Symmetry: D2
Subunit: 275 residues, 4 copies
């Protein structure tokens, strides 16, 4: 190692400095996903479907994931409307083994995976933890909202490493930064904070071959009146967000617009984390 | 409902504002634990034993936890030296059922639990996760360093609510705030970040009856050249000692911190600042 | 008052909930700045010129600011190459009165201001503050890197409120989140942290009519061995380029981020994670 | 430098590792300030007076600071009640020169300064900044709540460096971490965030000879009804704090209880930063 500056972070970067990529000089071209393959978990639901069609509008082939609501006709919609390749995949993400089979199948079907969005999740709906006596709801949150994200990350990182390139986007939540009120959600808040800092941890470990980032959305239209009303009162923009207001953040992170961005948390929460 | 200011955080608080506690006018007496019962998990280990003995020095009865290394001699030493009640308990904290049995037996042996430190944990020692085929290592750390902490918290919070008083201290890590280098520890970093935010979430939920805070230690005193890089990145230029943590745990456990809840206390030699 | 949900953050918002904006259904059109006027301070410099040209490429009219290095040729180049309106303005932003004169003249020359980037700044280059007898260096950085940013913000916020629309982007620094080493930069770090929190404070105050976000760049490409340590501590292993920032500034300036306010966007190669 | 591990943070630490101090083995003795000299700015007001008498109860000599409310009889109270040496000092902290004269006078009067609390400050009381047209209130906040803290820090650090030991405690605010509502306070929020991160910056620079930390209190009893009521609703403990609830944090940081703690922000806010 004499005559080499080795990294304190990850010596697999090789002799420092690493060199910068080549980038289109037109900013609008940086956001293109033409020729890239995207994989979006939870793209049966509101947020995931939104980023999936946003990625298709950017020119990416898109693998769609579902569990209990088959979304083949969504994949058909992307092919019919944007001319891109798409397909739907069924997978219980709580199961590490199904996740690995699905991602391997996608690699074969599309040839590679350039972008991965780990987005599928479930909420905690049971009020304060102290009145919830068995640990099954806690475990169900940890299993999918944290362990499931890691199974997807661990599996696709080996694809990114083999090819030397990739962008992983994790859907976290403002619940990883703050505590939601009045609906108390300790298990979900803890899983999401794990997700945000797993993002930073994987950004360091994957540095030689991929970028890892995360979006922390606020309340997204996607509920008792008096509760929503307190949400609106505590959010500086004064309203809930729309799923279409998130896709710009996911496309920014997925594309060459963010080649120096890794380990970042993009809060898209109407300012809720500020007060 | 009408004629009452209701909390937006937690309606169990009752009509606002809540009542300030009665505190001694001498700052030194605020740190006393006389008449209080403390339970410290992982107190057969370095940090947990230092905290357990410090609580005994502050006057607390101390319940000692161990798993593989029996700590009954540690319990006798607190009894012999400080004249407090102490007993050691064997428990695998990754087992929920076993956690609930131990805490309940402790309530009966001491009468109550006033201070709880969720401290037992294991590190990640396999390097970059991308080369660990099997998920047992990931799951071993989540179950003990996250699920295990929740098992103790859920269980002792019931005691705190029954008595209307209590202080939970969670041992997190600077690994919950930063990413350690060059030893890559993704699973551990993630579990400790969940611990830190679990601290804040439970502070809100438990606020009518208990405080919840956490301590995030840095490196507390295995290849030379790796430490060398730790020292180079630590503003104070050295690793910490177990005795440099006990003031933090005593502050959070005692009446010195009655307005402090949901806080993360960094004791890391400044490592999180660069 | 009765029959209206009033905000706890800012009653200027009116009865809640507020109305979502109308957005294009194609994600790519959300990033367009066609029909919008952008003002970028410090746009004779590296980062600011890259952002100014990117906004022109997105279709915006661009007002260019300079102090000591005239940038009229930069304004002609945006006009010549992208067919947008552009003019360069001379201003010492540490002078409040001079800031207000420039922004007002810009409103008249372009009709309005839709996007503002507060970007001009100077670094600290004297090493450890303990050896700097005189306070002019501390004051020089506070006045330009903090007070100057506020002078522009206070002034352009009036335009945004009059028009009911606008996006302010503040150039902060990873120095607002961490402490740079080994070059010790206390005054600069403090001013950038104030900038980052000024971003959040103004997002709340301006929420009825404008968004306020900030970008925190890392090292963007002076002794070899110091960079060497920068590279060793940066997860990506290299310094950034100015072109790797423009996507962040375009995202925050455009309709792509209509639910994003008070956010700090780190573009630092991961430096804030270790 | 061959044969020496030099710090990446501050090479004035000398060859690494630095060694740990010697510490009493009884935790209660770590909190003692016997034989130490403390200097507390803003100790005419609520918070500063509280930590001053707490420091005196710990056995420290205490220099008391005032500007418009002479507090000599407070210094007399500390001497008469605790047998400690105390004195009052008049100083406009916005003026860098008066600050340096006062601290030099205290060094001569007491012999040294072991602990410094930079606590004096003023609030912003003028609502949203956009309706405040001259910059004088902004400047008055920056001048005292940020520049004044630095003048005190810069001056006492040279005392700490000369003697190789010291503890600086800065009174920040939860306003350095969050945005206060409904009373809008941009200038104060910005000054306080500067204070919190100046703490971290000085912790790195002063590492070879002092520790630097900061306390961020919430709302402390020390105001229109409807406004306070919204504060109470947003604070998890459900009430404002008392000044006596802060002194434990200041004594922890000032004493040998925290010899491995530097660059830390201790939030004492009833949990307000969590929701
Ligand atoms: N404050 C908050 O609560 C915040 C929430 N989020 C998070 O954003 C993510 C997406 O949320 P959103 O689209 O709005 O919610 P939706 O319920 O609308 O969609 C959830 C998706 O997860 C999928 N999924 C559910 N369970 C499983 C399972 N075992 N295995 C595999 N996939 C599963 C569902 O698929 P299917 O329907 O086919 O079963 C669905 O596509 C979530 O992770 C959410 O937690 C982010 C912002 C803030
Ligand atoms: N030392 C350091 O540098 C750092 C430590 N920490 C954390 O502080 C805590 C203790 O650390 P430390 O004292 O240094 O390490 P030690 O190994 O010395 O102590 C570990 C303790 O955890 C107990 N324990 C381990 N596994 C289990 C299990 N299944 N069930 C119940 N108890 C178990 C051990 O009990 P037994 O030995 O009897 O089996 C032991 O008492 C941990 O949370 C650690 O992650 C955080 C930051 C830095
Ligand atoms: N490059 C980096 O690594 C980092 C930069 N930043 C910040 O990004 C901003 C610009 O940085 P960068 O482009 O790299 O440096 P440059 O020196 O290249 O650009 C500085 C710009 O600020 C302008 N300016 C300087 N002083 C004044 C003044 N009194 N009044 C008005 N304008 C003034 C300069 O104008 P002129 O030349 O005409 O006098 C110039 O356009 C700054 O806020 C910087 O602190 C943040 C993190 C890292
Ligand atoms: N959310 C919030 O707003 C928070 C506020 N804080 C901060 O805690 C600190 C102390 O607050 P607190 O005691 O409660 O307020 P007080 O008004 O009661 O006391 C303020 C003290 O500052 C001194 N002082 C005022 N102006 C000057 C000046 N030019 N020069 C020198 N000294 C001056 C005053 O001295 P004299 O009376 O003799 O003129 C007084 O002793 C403050 O910095 C406050 O900003 C911390 C927690 C949260």
């Amino acid at each position: 190692s004499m005559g080499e500056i080795e990294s304190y972070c990850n010596k697999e970067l090789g002799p420092l400095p690493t060199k910068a990529p080549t980038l289109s000089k037109n900013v609008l071209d940086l956001f293109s996903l033409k020729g890239k393959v995207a994989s979006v978990t939870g793209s049966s639901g509101g947020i995931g479907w939104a980023v999936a069609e946003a990625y298709a509008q950017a020119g990416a082939d898109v693998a769609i994931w579902y569990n209990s609501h088959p979304a083949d006709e969504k994949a058909e919609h992307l092919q019919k409307t944007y001319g891109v390749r798409s397909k739907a995949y069924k997978c219980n993400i709580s199961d590490p083994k199904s996740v690995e089979e699905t991602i391997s199948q996608q690699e074969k079907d599309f040839g590679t995976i350039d972008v991965f969005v780990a987005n599928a999740g479930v909420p905690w709906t049971e009020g304060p933890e102290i009145n919830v006596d068995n640990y099954d709801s806690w475990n169900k949150i940890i299993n999918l909202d944290l362990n499931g994200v890691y199974y997807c990350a661990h599996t696709v990182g080996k694809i990114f490493k083999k090819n030397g390139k990739g962008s992983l986007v994790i859907t976290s939540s403002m619940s990883g930064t703050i505590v939601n009120v009045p609906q108390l959600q300790a298990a979900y808040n803890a899983a999401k904070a794990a997700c945000t800092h797993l993002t930073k941890s994987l950004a360091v470990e994957w540095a030689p071959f991929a970028r890892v980032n995360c979006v922390s959305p606020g309340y997204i239209a996607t509920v008792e009146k008096d509760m929503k009303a307190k949400w609106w009162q505590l959010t500086p923009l004064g309203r809930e967000g729309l799923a279409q207001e998130l896709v710009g953040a996911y496309l920014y992170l997925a594309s060459n617009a963010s080649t120096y961005t890794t380990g970042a948390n993009l809060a898209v929460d109407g300012g809720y984390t500020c007060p």
